[PDB]
């Protein structure tokens, strides 16, 4: 259920967004709510490799954002950690992704998760 190992197999054959989501669950029996795994962070690492970020990783990130069970804080921290301003394509893609899910910032869960969201913000 390793992140790189599963992402490579997903990438080799063109898969729809829902099929990859269905498949990921099948790959690892204990999901652990995507916390130890840092799935949002892992996608970014694949995305920044190419000079132009591939649209399929961005679509996977969009789908992960769509589900309420993926916290917005982890995505924000992963985006902030990268920086390094190599080229305009990556910053434009990150700008579009950030523009997509902002202005709501709704968090459901325990209070310490809200505290972590404040620090991530």
């Amino acid at each position: 259920v390793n992140l790189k190992q599963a992402i490579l197999q997903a990438w080799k054959e063109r898969w729809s967004d829902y099929q990859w989501a269905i498949n990921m669950k099948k790959f690892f029996p204990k999901g652990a709510t995507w916390d130890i795994l840092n799935l949002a962070d892992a996608l970014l690492e694949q995305a920044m490799i190419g000079p132009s970020p591939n649209p399929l990783i961005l679509s996977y990130l969009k789908y992960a954002i769509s589900s309420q069970m993926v916290s917005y804080s982890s995505v924000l921290t992963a985006i902030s950690k990268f920086d390094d301003f190599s080229r305009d394509l990556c910053v434009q893609a990150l700008l579009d992704i950030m523009d997509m899910f902002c202005d709501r910032l709704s968090c459901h869960g325990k209070a310490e998760e809200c505290i972590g969201l404040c620090r991530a913000l």
Binding site: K4, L8, W11, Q46, I49, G50, P51, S52, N54
Partner: protein, 467 residues
């Protein structure tokens, strides 16, 4: 099955002089006989009257006025051409080619040659403007001959620099049915057959040609009847101002035997170079991936389509490649690399040809590089190997191939940008946690020596595996 019925009818009727008498009586007082003669022409016993009939039938299909003066010497006469075998001037030149077909049983090529001479005058002119129009044509081949002479004066190198990277292209001046053609490209794959020496005795189909000649056009244009080039720079060519000249309703066209897939930016830089619009009406723009695949699948005819489904397979002595062209890739401009097909080029003065042919050379080089992945080979669902490769364009004359690291697990991208006809630069993008694979100059040299993506991928794989 009609043979039995014919035999039965003949047996019925077999139960002459009377027929001859009836025909004689009719004689004393169309196309079917010509059709019978031309159908019997192919097997005619070799003799002088038989060849006379063959030539008269050939003229009948070609529409030439069939007039004979003797059994051995014949004259082809039409509006403005006159050729004798044993108008508006004498015979151009006693070229040995036409004698070569005539002396042997090569009359089909002779008929095509006659049709080509006729097609030289498919003009709507009034037999005086047409005359003048062909006179101008002479001026144009003189000007291109002077261009080639100047470029030969520039450097005493081989014809390879004349064809690939040079002004205009290699000359084959008009002689008989073969028009004056210009050689601008030969691919390294096409260059080597089964190492081909490139001495002066080069064939006309060895690669692709670019003919220049005149066809009537809907517009009226100012063209020089007299030769335009009289003074020559040491190494340049300068065109003297026109007007002699007069508003002649025709244009100079560069004809390509087959269409080339060209991007949109190539089209607008073409009107930037020339100024005359290429297309009368706006055509439908499509990504040039399907266009190039259909174009270079025609270099190997097959009546049965391959059903590739944009999943192309390549067979190598040690590797097997599975290719995904990945059409409709997201460019920064928001669209994809849209492209169309070009077959004809319009131009006004002989000073436009070098830039037009240079841009054509660049586009052909880029198209061949992209289409090297295109193959008819199928090695389906082979579990060992079967490396996955994805092609994604980035900008005009730019693209990139992204693929899994041959040893490691991260992705690796190799980006190609074509500078000139034989100039291509290469860059590498790799992850932070990775090892050395290759150098950009090595990839550029491999591209310049082969101009083929699968071969470059093989070289990179071998060099990374040796490390």
């Amino acid at each position: 099955l009609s043979k039995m019925s014919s035999l039965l009818e003949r047996l019925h009727a077999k139960f002459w002089s009377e027929t001859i008498k009836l025909v004689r009586q009719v004689m004393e007082k169309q196309h079917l006989v010509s059709c019978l003669e031309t159908l019997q022409k192919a097997l005619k016993v070799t003799s002088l009257p038989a060849m006379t009939d063959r030539l008269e039938s050939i003229a009948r299909q070609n529409g030439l006025g069939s007039h004979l003066s003797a059994s051995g010497t014949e004259c082809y006469i039409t509006s403005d051409m006159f050729y004798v075998e044993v108008h508006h001037g004498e015979n151009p030149v006693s070229c040995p080619e036409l004698v070569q077909q005539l002396r042997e049983k090569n009359f089909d090529e002779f008929s095509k040659h006659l049709k080509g001479l006729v097609n030289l005058y498919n003009l709507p002119g009034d037999n005086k403007l047409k005359t003048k129009m062909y006179l101008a044509l002479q001026s144009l081949e003189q000007d291109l001959s002077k261009m080639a002479i100047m470029y030969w004066k520039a450097t005493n190198a081989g014809p390879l620099d004349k064809i690939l990277h040079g002004s205009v292209g290699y000359l084959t001046p008009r002689s008989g049915g073969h028009l004056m053609n210009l050689k601008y490209y030969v691919s390294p794959s096409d260059l080597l057959d089964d190492i081909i020496l490139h001495e002066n005795n080069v064939s006309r189909s060895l690669g692709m040609n670019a003919s220049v000649t005149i066809e009537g056009t809907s517009a009226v244009y100012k063209l020089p009847i007299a030769p335009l080039i009289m003074g020559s720079h040491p190494v340049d060519n300068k065109w003297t101002p026109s007007f002699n000249s007069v508003d002649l309703p025709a244009c100079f066209f560069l004809k390509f035997p087959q269409p080339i897939p060209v991007s949109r930016a190539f089209v607008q830089k073409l009107q930037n170079c020339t100024g005359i619009p290429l297309f009368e009406t706006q055509p439908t723009y499509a990504p040039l991936y399907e266009l190039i695949t259909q174009f270079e699948l025609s270099k190997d005819p097959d009546p049965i389509p391959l059903n590739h489904n944009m999943r192309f397979y390549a067979a190598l002595p040690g590797q097997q490649h599975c290719y995904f062209l990945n059409k409709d890739a997201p460019l920064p401009d928001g669209r994809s690399l849209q492209g169309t097909l070009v077959s004809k080029i319009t131009f006004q003065h002989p000073g436009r040809v070098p830039l037009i042919l240079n841009l054509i050379r660049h586009q052909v080089a880029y198209n061949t590089l992209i289409g090297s992945c295109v193959k008819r080979t199928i090695l389906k669902e082979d579990s060992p190997g079967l490396l996955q490769f994805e092609v994604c364009p980035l900008s005009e004359s730019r693209f990139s191939v992204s693929f899994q690291h041959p040893v490691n697990d991260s992705l690796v991208c190799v980006v190609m940008d074509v500078q000139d006809s034989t100039h291509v630069s290469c860059k590498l993008y790799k992850g932070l946690s990775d090892a050395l694979i290759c150098t950009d100059d090595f990839i550029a040299k491999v591209v310049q020596r082969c101009m083929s993506i699968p071969v470059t991928m093989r070289a990179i794989r071998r060099k990374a595996e040796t490390i």
